[PDB]
């Protein structure tokens, strides 16, 4: 957490754990961009999750619902809320930490060209037994009225093509570099070359 800004790819993660991971980092002093928040997984069965959400929604302020619990139903929003929950947001430091976090659905403008990081101690594949029921967050959101899910998916798909295109180019570049290295290893100095070989490069 000594980087300028960590971009976290939220696909295949387990919600609460991910949030927890984020929160500590934020507290420490790290700018976090939680990206691709539609594919965050919850450890409960989908129906159960939905029920829970419904229950949460039901707890509103009786006198004037303009105040009280704002039931933000965007997956990113939900994630943000979760993060906040795990923070001392009522102080100043906590507030600052919260501010530092930025959440995104899918991938927007700058966070497509930035390196996407994964939290391995929070992954669904590493935290759930494969005979247990899990729930995609996007789906849950859709169920409790988010609407912009299909659109998001489409956008993601579109982005994927672009990424693939870029990836091909990158691969080509890498290959070229390798070739160059191969060529030039004979053009250096013997002892130096040997040394290089010894140290892996």
């Amino acid at each position: 957490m000594y980087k300028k800004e960590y971009v976290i790819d939220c696909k295949g993660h387990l919600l609460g754990r991910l949030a927890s991971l984020i929160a500590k980092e934020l507290l420490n002093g790290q700018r976090i961009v939680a990206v691709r928040c539609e594919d965050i997984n919850i450890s409960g069965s989908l129906y159960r999750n939905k029920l829970k959400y419904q229950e949460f929604l039901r707890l509103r302020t009786n006198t004037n619902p303009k105040k009280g619990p704002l039931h933000l139903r965007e997956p990113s929003k939900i994630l943000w809320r979760c993060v906040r929950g795990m923070l001392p947001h009522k102080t100043y430091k906590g507030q600052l930490a919260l501010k530092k976090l930025k959440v995104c659905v899918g991938m927007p403008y700058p966070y497509d060209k930035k390196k996407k990081y994964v939290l391995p101690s929070a992954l669904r594949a590493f935290r759930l037994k494969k005979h247990r029921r899990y729930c995609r967050l996007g789906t849950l959101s859709s169920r409790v009225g988010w609407n912009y899910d299909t659109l998001v998916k489409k956008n993601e798909v579109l982005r994927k093509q672009v990424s693939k295109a870029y990836y091909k180019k990158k691969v080509n570049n890498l290959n070229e570099k390798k070739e160059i290295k191969t060529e030039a290893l004979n053009l250096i100095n013997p002892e130096q070359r040997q040394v290089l070989e010894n140290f892996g490069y």
């Binding site: 290295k181 030039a184 250096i188 100095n189 040394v195 290089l196 140290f199 892996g200 490069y201």
Partner: protein
Amino acid sequence: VELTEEELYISKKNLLFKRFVEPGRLCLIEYGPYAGKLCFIVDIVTITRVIVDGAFITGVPRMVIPLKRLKLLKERIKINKNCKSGFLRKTVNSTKVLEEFNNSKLGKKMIIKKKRDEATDFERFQVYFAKRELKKKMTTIKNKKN
């Protein structure tokens, strides 16, 4: 009775689970006082615990471990179930399995890492210099290509 051409099929039939925990599997201990160390599966205690032995080439004594603390390598050497440590040592040396492991990508990378760890400052500097030289040469080549 022979297979004639079915043998080939058997050889090249994709199996999802390569590397089984079984007697004579190589094994890299990941967690504990011993880590990064190699050690062979002698017997197996239960569904979770196994007895390993790092043949006196390696530093790790015969001991029980949780399988969870082991990462199976692609290497195996056929051994009798009740094989004692001396026998294991004899066999592995004969088969040159350690050499094979070293040759393999993972082993190579491990060794590289070790080298990096153990290097003197000067050696690091030498490496840097070499890299710089390569870059220069590489850059020149790139320019030429352009």
